[PDB]
Design a protein around this motif. Structure first.
Motif, PDB file in Angstrom:
ATOM      1  N   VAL A 299      -4.701  14.617  -4.187  1.00 50.64           N
ATOM      2  CA  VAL A 299      -5.092  15.523  -3.111  1.00 50.64           C
ATOM      3  C   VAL A 299      -4.682  16.916  -3.540  1.00 50.64           C
ATOM      4  CG1 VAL A 299      -3.007  15.208  -1.745  1.00 50.64           C
ATOM      5  CG2 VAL A 299      -5.181  15.935  -0.573  1.00 50.64           C
ATOM      6  N   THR A 300      -5.555  17.871  -3.232  1.00 47.01           N
ATOM      7  CA  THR A 300      -5.196  19.238  -3.342  1.00 47.01           C
ATOM      8  C   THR A 300      -5.128  19.779  -1.949  1.00 47.01           C
ATOM      9  OG1 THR A 300      -6.206  19.267  -5.626  1.00 47.01           O
ATOM     10  CG2 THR A 300      -5.912  21.326  -4.499  1.00 47.01           C
ATOM     11  N   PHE A 301      -4.315  20.831  -1.746  1.00 51.43           N
ATOM     12  CA  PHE A 301      -4.215  21.522  -0.454  1.00 51.43           C
ATOM     13  C   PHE A 301      -3.914  22.958  -0.690  1.00 51.43           C
ATOM     14  CE2 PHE A 301       0.410  21.596  -0.128  1.00 51.43           C
ATOM     15  CZ  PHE A 301       0.813  20.507  -0.923  1.00 51.43           C
TER      16      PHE A 301
ATOM     17  N   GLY B   4       0.799  -1.236   0.000  1.00 51.75           N
ATOM     18  CA  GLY B   4       0.000   0.000   0.000  1.00 51.75           C
ATOM     19  C   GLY B   4       0.826   1.277   0.000  1.00 51.75           C
ATOM     20  N   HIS B   5       0.388   2.250  -0.813  1.00 46.25           N
ATOM     21  CA  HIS B   5       1.062   3.569  -0.826  1.00 46.25           C
ATOM     22  C   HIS B   5       0.035   4.663  -0.686  1.00 46.25           C
ATOM     23  CE1 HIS B   5       4.544   1.356  -2.089  1.00 46.25           C
ATOM     24  NE2 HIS B   5       4.230   1.242  -3.482  1.00 46.25           N
ATOM     25  N   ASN B   6       0.456   5.673   0.058  1.00 45.02           N
ATOM     26  CA  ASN B   6      -0.157   6.968   0.221  1.00 45.02           C
ATOM     27  C   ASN B   6       0.954   7.995   0.147  1.00 45.02           C
ATOM     28  OD1 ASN B   6       0.869   6.806   2.751  1.00 45.02           O
ATOM     29  ND2 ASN B   6      -0.989   6.531   3.888  1.00 45.02           N
ATOM     30  N   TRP B   7       0.583   9.227   0.122  1.00 46.22           N
ATOM     31  CA  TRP B   7       1.354  10.495   0.114  1.00 46.22           C
ATOM     32  C   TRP B   7       0.776  11.256   1.295  1.00 46.22           C
ATOM     33  CZ3 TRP B   7       0.917  15.725  -0.525  1.00 46.22           C
ATOM     34  CH2 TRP B   7       2.149  16.390  -0.689  1.00 46.22           C
ATOM     35  N   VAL B   8       1.632  11.565   2.237  1.00 47.99           N
ATOM     36  CA  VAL B   8       1.297  12.317   3.461  1.00 47.99           C
ATOM     37  C   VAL B   8       2.342  13.397   3.636  1.00 47.99           C
ATOM     38  CG1 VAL B   8       0.872  12.042   5.949  1.00 47.99           C
ATOM     39  CG2 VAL B   8       0.516  10.103   4.431  1.00 47.99           C
ATOM     40  N   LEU B   9       1.923  14.616   3.854  1.00 49.01           N
ATOM     41  CA  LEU B   9       2.789  15.766   4.100  1.00 49.01           C
ATOM     42  C   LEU B   9       2.639  16.138   5.573  1.00 49.01           C
ATOM     43  CD1 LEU B   9       4.321  17.900   2.430  1.00 49.01           C
ATOM     44  CD2 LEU B   9       2.255  19.091   2.344  1.00 49.01           C
ATOM     45  N   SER B  10       3.747  16.343   6.253  1.00 44.32           N
ATOM     46  CA  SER B  10       3.774  17.051   7.562  1.00 44.32           C
ATOM     47  C   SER B  10       5.050  17.893   7.581  1.00 44.32           C
ATOM     48  CB  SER B  10       3.712  16.073   8.701  1.00 44.32           C
ATOM     49  OG  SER B  10       4.893  15.229   8.679  1.00 44.32           O
ATOM     50  N   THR B  11       5.248  18.595   8.675  1.00 41.02           N
ATOM     51  CA  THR B  11       6.587  19.089   9.016  1.00 41.02           C
ATOM     52  C   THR B  11       7.587  17.904   9.171  1.00 41.02           C
ATOM     53  OG1 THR B  11       6.297  19.028  11.292  1.00 41.02           O
ATOM     54  CG2 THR B  11       5.618  21.113  10.213  1.00 41.02           C
ATOM     55  N   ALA B  12       8.876  18.174   8.942  1.00 40.04           N
ATOM     56  CA  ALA B  12       9.955  17.241   9.279  1.00 40.04           C
ATOM     57  C   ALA B  12       9.923  16.851  10.765  1.00 40.04           C
ATOM     58  CB  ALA B  12      11.249  17.857   8.866  1.00 40.04           C
ATOM     59  N   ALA B  13       9.731  17.801  11.665  1.00 39.38           N
ATOM     60  CA  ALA B  13       9.607  17.544  13.118  1.00 39.38           C
ATOM     61  C   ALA B  13       8.488  16.518  13.417  1.00 39.38           C
ATOM     62  CB  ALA B  13       9.401  18.871  13.795  1.00 39.38           C
TER      63      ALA B  13
ATOM     64  N   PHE C  87       7.385  14.648   2.685  1.00 37.87           N
ATOM     65  CA  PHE C  87       6.340  13.742   2.215  1.00 37.87           C
ATOM     66  C   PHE C  87       6.810  12.314   2.408  1.00 37.87           C
ATOM     67  CE2 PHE C  87       8.620  14.636  -1.744  1.00 37.87           C
ATOM     68  CZ  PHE C  87       8.740  13.360  -2.201  1.00 37.87           C
ATOM     69  N   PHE C  88       5.882  11.353   2.625  1.00 37.34           N
ATOM     70  CA  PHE C  88       6.177   9.959   3.019  1.00 37.34           C
ATOM     71  C   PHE C  88       4.933   9.115   2.860  1.00 37.34           C
ATOM     72  CE2 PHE C  88       5.541  12.614   6.826  1.00 37.34           C
ATOM     73  CZ  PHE C  88       4.524  12.001   7.457  1.00 37.34           C
ATOM     74  N   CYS C  89       5.201   7.867   2.813  1.00 40.88           N
ATOM     75  CA  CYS C  89       4.183   6.788   2.877  1.00 40.88           C
ATOM     76  C   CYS C  89       4.105   6.315   4.294  1.00 40.88           C
ATOM     77  CB  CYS C  89       4.637   5.546   2.145  1.00 40.88           C
ATOM     78  SG  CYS C  89       3.251   4.436   1.844  1.00 40.88           S
ATOM     79  N   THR C  90       2.910   6.065   4.780  1.00 41.13           N
ATOM     80  CA  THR C  90       2.814   5.540   6.176  1.00 41.13           C
ATOM     81  C   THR C  90       2.481   4.099   6.179  1.00 41.13           C
ATOM     82  OG1 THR C  90       0.519   6.215   6.315  1.00 41.13           O
ATOM     83  CG2 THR C  90       2.068   7.810   7.114  1.00 41.13           C
ATOM     84  N   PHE C  91       2.407   3.398   5.075  1.00 43.59           N
ATOM     85  CA  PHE C  91       2.186   1.944   5.090  1.00 43.59           C
ATOM     86  C   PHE C  91       3.378   1.393   5.862  1.00 43.59           C
ATOM     87  CE2 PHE C  91       0.111  -1.894   3.245  1.00 43.59           C
ATOM     88  CZ  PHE C  91       1.123  -2.839   3.390  1.00 43.59           C
ATOM     89  N   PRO C  92       3.225   0.375   6.738  1.00 43.51           N
ATOM     90  CA  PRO C  92       4.288  -0.126   7.628  1.00 43.51           C
ATOM     91  C   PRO C  92       5.620  -0.468   6.943  1.00 43.51           C
ATOM     92  CG  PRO C  92       2.274  -1.033   8.318  1.00 43.51           C
ATOM     93  CD  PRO C  92       1.998  -0.350   7.035  1.00 43.51           C
TER      94      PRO C  92
ATOM     95  N   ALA D 135      -1.655  17.396   4.551  1.00 42.60           N
ATOM     96  CA  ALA D 135      -2.486  16.891   3.468  1.00 42.60           C
ATOM     97  C   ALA D 135      -2.179  15.410   3.308  1.00 42.60           C
ATOM     98  CB  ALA D 135      -2.084  17.648   2.225  1.00 42.60           C
ATOM     99  N   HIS D 136      -3.045  14.645   2.697  1.00 40.84           N
ATOM    100  CA  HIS D 136      -2.732  13.247   2.420  1.00 40.84           C
ATOM    101  C   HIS D 136      -3.657  12.760   1.332  1.00 40.84           C
ATOM    102  CE1 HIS D 136      -6.293  11.496   4.495  1.00 40.84           C
ATOM    103  NE2 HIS D 136      -6.166  12.604   5.228  1.00 40.84           N
ATOM    104  N   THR D 137      -3.196  11.799   0.532  1.00 42.19           N
ATOM    105  CA  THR D 137      -4.056  10.946  -0.228  1.00 42.19           C
ATOM    106  C   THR D 137      -4.622   9.763   0.543  1.00 42.19           C
ATOM    107  OG1 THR D 137      -2.440   9.367  -0.942  1.00 42.19           O
ATOM    108  CG2 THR D 137      -2.498  11.383  -2.206  1.00 42.19           C
TER     109      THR D 137
END
Ligand SMILES: [Ca+2]
Ligand SMILES: [Co+2]
Length: 127
Positions: free
Chosen positions: A94-96, A44-53, A109-114, A81-83
Protein backbone atom coordinates in the motif's frame (compact mmCIF):
# COMPACT_ATOMS: atom_id res chain seq x y z
CA UNK A 1 13.55 5.64 -0.16
CA UNK A 2 10.05 6.17 1.51
CA UNK A 3 9.22 2.42 1.85
CA UNK A 4 9.49 -0.39 4.33
CA UNK A 5 9.49 -4.21 3.76
CA UNK A 6 7.49 -6.05 6.52
CA UNK A 7 6.88 -9.77 7.07
CA UNK A 8 4.09 -11.39 9.15
CA UNK A 9 4.79 -15.08 9.96
CA UNK A 10 3.05 -18.21 11.41
CA UNK A 11 4.05 -17.02 15.04
CA UNK A 12 1.96 -13.84 14.78
CA UNK A 13 5.04 -11.55 14.60
CA UNK A 14 5.81 -8.57 12.39
CA UNK A 15 9.71 -8.47 11.79
CA UNK A 16 9.68 -4.74 12.98
CA UNK A 17 7.79 -2.85 15.78
CA UNK A 18 8.54 0.81 14.85
CA UNK A 19 8.40 2.66 11.44
CA UNK A 20 9.82 6.10 10.68
CA UNK A 21 8.41 8.02 7.68
CA UNK A 22 10.88 10.73 6.55
CA UNK A 23 8.88 14.08 6.65
CA UNK A 24 10.40 14.81 3.17
CA UNK A 25 8.43 11.84 1.68
CA UNK A 26 5.23 12.82 -0.17
CA UNK A 27 4.16 9.12 -0.52
CA UNK A 28 5.07 6.10 1.78
CA UNK A 29 4.86 2.49 0.66
CA UNK A 30 4.67 -0.63 2.87
CA UNK A 31 5.43 -3.99 1.19
CA UNK A 32 4.01 -6.79 3.36
CA UNK A 33 4.70 -10.50 2.69
CA UNK A 34 3.73 -13.83 4.47
CA UNK A 35 6.57 -16.44 4.87
CA UNK A 36 5.57 -19.71 6.60
CA UNK A 37 2.97 -22.17 5.28
CA UNK A 38 -0.37 -21.21 6.91
CA UNK A 39 -3.31 -20.11 4.77
CA UNK A 40 -5.25 -16.82 4.96
CA UNK A 41 -8.43 -18.09 6.80
CA UNK A 42 -6.15 -19.49 9.63
CA UNK A 43 -3.11 -17.06 9.91
CA UNK A 44 -4.26 -14.00 7.90
CA UNK A 45 -2.17 -10.81 8.03
CA UNK A 46 -2.77 -7.25 6.95
CA UNK A 47 -1.11 -3.90 7.80
CA UNK A 48 -3.54 -1.21 8.96
CA UNK A 49 -2.55 2.29 10.12
CA UNK A 50 -4.74 4.50 12.33
CA UNK A 51 -4.20 6.87 15.21
CA UNK A 52 -3.37 5.18 18.57
CA UNK A 53 -6.73 6.55 19.88
CA UNK A 54 -8.66 4.80 16.98
CA UNK A 55 -6.87 1.38 16.90
CA UNK A 56 -9.26 -0.50 19.33
CA UNK A 57 -12.44 0.57 17.35
CA UNK A 58 -10.80 -0.46 14.02
CA UNK A 59 -9.71 -3.90 15.40
CA UNK A 60 -13.08 -4.65 17.02
CA UNK A 61 -15.10 -3.32 13.96
CA UNK A 62 -12.73 -5.36 11.78
CA UNK A 63 -13.40 -8.67 13.65
CA UNK A 64 -17.15 -8.00 13.43
CA UNK A 65 -16.84 -7.68 9.53
CA UNK A 66 -15.37 -11.18 8.95
CA UNK A 67 -13.04 -12.85 6.38
CA UNK A 68 -15.54 -11.63 3.77
CA UNK A 69 -14.18 -8.00 4.18
CA UNK A 70 -10.45 -8.81 5.01
CA UNK A 71 -11.52 -8.12 8.65
CA UNK A 72 -12.03 -4.42 8.18
CA UNK A 73 -15.18 -2.25 8.35
CA UNK A 74 -15.81 -1.11 4.69
CA UNK A 75 -14.75 2.59 4.19
CA UNK A 76 -13.64 2.88 7.94
CA UNK A 77 -12.68 6.61 7.92
CA UNK A 78 -10.41 5.87 10.95
CA UNK A 79 -8.13 3.76 8.65
CA UNK A 80 -5.44 5.95 7.30
CA UNK A 81 -4.11 3.18 5.00
CA UNK A 82 -4.24 -0.62 4.80
CA UNK A 83 -3.15 -3.57 2.77
CA UNK A 84 -5.09 -6.68 1.61
CA UNK A 85 -5.32 -9.64 4.01
CA UNK A 86 -2.82 -12.29 2.86
CA UNK A 87 -1.93 -15.93 3.63
CA UNK A 88 1.25 -18.05 3.03
CA UNK A 89 3.32 -17.06 -0.08
CA UNK A 90 1.14 -13.97 -1.02
CA UNK A 91 2.35 -10.36 -0.73
CA UNK A 92 0.67 -6.98 -0.81
CA UNK A 93 1.63 -3.30 -0.92
CA UNK A 94 0.00 0.00 0.00
CA UNK A 95 1.08 3.50 -0.67
CA UNK A 96 -0.37 6.51 1.16
CA UNK A 97 0.00 10.27 1.20
CA UNK A 98 2.26 11.59 4.05
CA UNK A 99 -0.12 14.67 4.16
CA UNK A 100 -2.54 12.28 6.06
CA UNK A 101 0.14 12.22 8.87
CA UNK A 102 1.34 15.03 11.32
CA UNK A 103 4.63 15.09 13.41
CA UNK A 104 4.34 14.15 17.16
CA UNK A 105 0.76 12.67 16.70
CA UNK A 106 0.66 8.89 17.58
CA UNK A 107 -0.04 6.34 14.82
CA UNK A 108 -0.12 2.61 15.30
CA UNK A 109 0.16 -0.18 12.73
CA UNK A 110 -1.55 -3.58 13.43
CA UNK A 111 -3.12 -6.67 12.00
CA UNK A 112 -6.88 -6.94 12.37
CA UNK A 113 -7.14 -10.69 11.80
CA UNK A 114 -8.88 -11.96 15.05
CA UNK A 115 -6.71 -11.67 18.16
CA UNK A 116 -3.54 -10.85 16.12
CA UNK A 117 -3.37 -7.18 17.32
CA UNK A 118 -2.18 -8.23 20.77
CA UNK A 119 1.27 -9.27 19.28
CA UNK A 120 1.08 -7.72 15.75
CA UNK A 121 1.32 -3.94 16.33
CA UNK A 122 4.04 -1.21 16.41
CA UNK A 123 4.47 2.59 16.22
CA UNK A 124 4.52 4.72 13.13
CA UNK A 125 6.20 8.09 13.43
CA UNK A 126 6.65 11.08 11.10
CA UNK A 127 10.38 12.13 11.91
CA1 LIG B 1 -2.11 -2.95 -3.33
CO1 LIG C 1 -2.41 -11.36 11.34
Amino acid sequence: ECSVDIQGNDQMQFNTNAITVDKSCKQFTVNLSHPGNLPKNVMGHNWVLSTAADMQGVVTDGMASGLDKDYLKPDDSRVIAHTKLIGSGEKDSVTFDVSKLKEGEQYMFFCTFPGHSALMKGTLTLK
